[PDB]
């Protein structure tokens, strides 16, 4: 609307809710959406993990830089940038830089191992990475690496 | 004439474009690879 | 210390008390998965431990949340802005009642009438007074200022208004008993709760020297107790307990939630469970 | 309990049962349930019902079926405008339109 | 306060103490979710807060629960008449051990054995008794009729039975140690534990006071520490040491969630890790 | 209590402060969905409860782990010396610190000046001594051996070093203020947290027996605070604080967790959330 006020809708993502007066029961309403949601959820982390990402190749001068999610370029339009702006979005896109390290996954039931791990910045909505972690967590519930299953 | 309206619009406001960055979790299989076949196991009996 | 508590601190301190909870919540999720390896924790917390976003506070690193609580705290109590940033879309029309207090009552103050017939000292939970002269039974020799309640133990020589062990009144008055001429000692002790919270005052020494620093004018470093009655002192006279409770519990979870930041420890009950 | 009769209610837990095992479990014939199907008219409603609510009362408690339920119920109740609802609507002659937005 | 505790206390105990936890659950989840809609926090409690499907409970509202808390504490501790085959209390089989005390020992209960050679006050934690006259060592002067465990530290002219600092029995006894005049004291402090919990107590007091309003005849309103006496005063001897602590958690926890169903705050840890 | 501990202790004790957490909350787990049945809960744990895996440990039985924290105790309390000092200080894996210490602090260790000038006495978080002949003001009366942080109430005679209240340092040293004859009394009363954690005393009571009985030479039943004043006294020289703390909290852990084992209940904070 302005000149650095920048604002993200809230579009639907996820279509579920049956509505039933007779029965005047939030508690059922939400069950309803929550039980699609959990299938969808379950249905995209069946026997696959998150491995492939869209990358920049590390050239001599520069590092390992993400280009996942919304193209920076999109942007331009979408937001109509001025000339400040379209000089910082350069800026802003050199420091999207890939992270490494080892996480523990499982629980105190499944059990407790440890893995190597990305974390890949993305350029979209907060919702977004709310779905992304509910979607990790699902997918790394029960992993366990060669040493600790033969022993 | 009645007027239908709502309340308790949630809309984000962010104030900075650096605040369009967010991140994800990735496995790297450059050290953590995928197996590909199940352990075999034999068994005998005592 | 000096500060200015606006008409509007109820409703902040619901933003503030929010931001810290979703921290604390942040920071133990955070702890529970990190894998012990090459990296140390603080490089863990600091990549991923930050990244919370609620209406008017889009944080992405730990600095991004202390930046957020320096404004929020000098909104609600020192001299700073009478408006918040984005307070219009906030809509705390409705809050949520904030955690019981759970402090232990050991100093509790207490002020002597303007006779001055009255030598006081301190113990660990129970004051006692000698008299320099004469006294007559039925007088109030104390009253306290800091608001206390619990029961009430070992009271000797002297009355206090209590039925079934538990005091009446939140604010007791001591009143002799009995004609106790020539250097006589009362005795009133009281296993009660005082306002604030007891968990996590080592986060809190480190959390009011930060913020001590940088409000180097209004705030100076201080033990919780002194800091609590201070901030008590303050709020106007006209405000409900419903509102007084979310505003001391901002007062206090603002330096633990910024010394809980430094050193990357659990989090009290009090904070995380809001 | 109070909310249907004796025999609406039977059928809500019926339908219930039938959601629950078609949304998470695979298919298989279902013992207990089959045996409570066949028998259904050897008892009366009364105690028919009350042998179902105590199936459903022998799971009650925080156990780790019921986290899940709710990680999910409170984003859900976090995000209605995600998921396509509103929690309530008001209706007036003047409304008094908010300068915040 | 009179009472009766009829010879299947535990077996309701355990019912109530599951529905109170089970309560206290659903209250936390419910803070975490309010927030983006238009609802005070009271009523969205009042909506999902009370959706608890027990056997015994024909309602999905806090009024249905409080009205089953308000049954089997009738049963248990007040009226051994009426029996509740309402709740699936016949078909229990077997109990689990309730959360071990915490309540710190303030206020300990001592019984001064007869002749009058001793004059009793009472200290924080401590027992100061002064000899009237001329007494030997090897006599008892104090034991305690509310039992306590812990460490002692602080004893002059007594002695009491102790390994490596930790109390070896529950009731510990003071003695004399070697002969003393009259008119001088002899000390003990305890850092010991009592029955009962200790958090909880803001809740406890707008509880008793509910449910003595409720039973009028029987229950009046009265401290923490009194309650738990009585209680377990009126404990009968044949009672294995796990039965009566199910029956204590549960005296204690039904007025706590019943003032927590009043005041939407948050949970002691001993009535939600139940 | 005789015991020496080397400079690998902090790894051994990440490891098993990560073991206690894990059988902590699996206890927690099974605890809260155990339907009351013809199986007791005793034998319900046993065959669900001790099945923990993760890296080193693979035992599914209660007595598994309880051999597990037996072989951590020995391997870094009791062995003499694990490695050269070089390979331990080369180690590049780093670990999760502690959650703060929560021990109140009632009996301060404190050790009197080589004259003999004053007399000791204990209290409820308070130390008087009184003088048996006269002494020049400004001078060290009391040094405190026990680590320890808070505010310092009720001081009397005698000068501490604070500001706001609050203790500037860790091992504060009383010093007279204002000269003095003979037989006067100084006091110095703290609200303050010493090291080790004050929740869950009871198993940490049926603990150190059991592992006690196996270690008989070295390990003898004894009060908690004896405990931790001797294991922070047997401490390595040379050790920063943040190792320390690790170590003092496995040491502490492994007795709460031995008892919890024995007696089914709930397990502390500061033993789950590690």
């Not at chain 1, 609307?1 to 993200?8: A, F, G, K, Q």
């Not at chain 1, 005047?24 to 492939?52: C, G, P, Q, R, V």
């Not at chain 1, 109509?80 to 992270?99: F, G, H, K, N, W």
Request: a negative charge; glycine letters at 6%.
């Amino acid at each position: 609307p302005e000149e650095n006020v920048y604002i993200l809708l809230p579009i639907q993502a996820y279509t579920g809710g049956v509505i039933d007066r007779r029965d005047a029961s939030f508690s059922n309403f939400a069950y309803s959406i929550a039980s699609k949601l959990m299938m969808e959820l379950s249905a995209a982390t069946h026997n696959k993990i998150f491995t492939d990402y869209t990358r920049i190749a590390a050239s001599a001068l520069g590092p390992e830089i993400s280009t996942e999610g919304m193209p920076l370029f999109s942007l331009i339009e979408s937001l109509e940038l001025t000339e400040a702006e379209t000089s910082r979005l350069p800026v802003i896109q050199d420091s999207m830089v890939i992270q490494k390290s080892t996480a523990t996954v499982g629980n105190a039931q499944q059990g407790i191992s440890t893995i190597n791990i990305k974390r890949v910045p993305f350029v979209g909505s907060a919702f977004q990475q709310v779905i992304d972690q509910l979607l990790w967590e699902y997918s790394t519930t029960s992993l366990t690496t060669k040493e600790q299953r033969r022993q | 004439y009645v007027a239908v309206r709502i309340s308790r619009f949630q809309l984000e406001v962010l104030r900075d474009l650096h605040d369009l960055v967010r991140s994800r979790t990735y496995l790297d299989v450059s050290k953590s690879p995928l197996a590909t076949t199940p352990i075999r196991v034999v068994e005998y009996v005592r | 210390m000096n500060l200015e508590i606006n008409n509007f601190a109820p409703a902040i301190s619901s933003i503030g008390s929010q931001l810290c909870s979703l921290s604390a919540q942040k920071l133990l999720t955070c702890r529970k998965q990190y894998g012990n390896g090459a990296k140390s924790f603080e490089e863990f917390y600091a990549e991923i431990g930050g990244i919370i976003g609620m209406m008017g506070i889009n944080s992405q690193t730990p600095s991004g949340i202390r930046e957020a609580i320096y404004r929020l705290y000098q909104s609600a109590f020192l001299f700073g802005d009478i408006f918040p940033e984005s307070f219009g879309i906030q809509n705390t029309q409705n809050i949520k009642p904030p955690p019981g207090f759970t402090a232990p009552a050991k100093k509790l103050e207490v002020v002597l009438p303007q006779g001055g017939a009255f030598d006081l000292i301190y113990n660990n939970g129970e004051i006692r007074v000698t008299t320099t002269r004469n006294v007559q039974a039925g007088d109030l020799v104390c009253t306290v200022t800091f608001p206390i309640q619990g029961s009430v133990i070992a009271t000797r020589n002297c009355h206090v208004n209590e039925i079934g062990g538990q005091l009446t009144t939140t604010r007791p008055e001591i009143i002799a008993s009995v004609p106790m001429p020539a250097r006589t000692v009362i005795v009133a002790s009281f296993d009660a709760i005082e306002i604030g919270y007891g968990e996590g005052d080592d986060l809190f020494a480190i959390g009011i020297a930060i913020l001590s620093n940088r409000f180097n004018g209004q705030i100076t470093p201080m033990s919780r107790h002194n800091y609590m009655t201070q901030m008590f002192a303050n709020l106007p006279a006209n405000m409900s307990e419903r509102d007084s409770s979310a505003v001391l519990h901002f007062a206090q979870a603002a330096p633990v939630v910024l010394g809980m930041m430094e050193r990357l420890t659990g989090a009290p009950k009090w904070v995380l469970d809001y | 309990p109070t909310r249907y009769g004796t025999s609406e209610s039977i059928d809500k837990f019926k339908i219930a049962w039938e959601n629950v095992e078609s949304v998470l479990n695979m298919e298989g014939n279902d013992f207990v349930k089959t045996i409570m199907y066949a028998y259904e008219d050897n008892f009366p409603k009364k105690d028919f019902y009350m042998m179902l609510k105590q199936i459903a009362s022998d799971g009650q408690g925080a156990h780790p079926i019921a986290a899940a339920i709710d990680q999910l119920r409170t984003i859900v109740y976090r995000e209605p405008e995600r998921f396509g609802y509103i929690d309530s609507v008001i209706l007036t002659h003047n409304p008094d339109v908010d300068t915040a937005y």
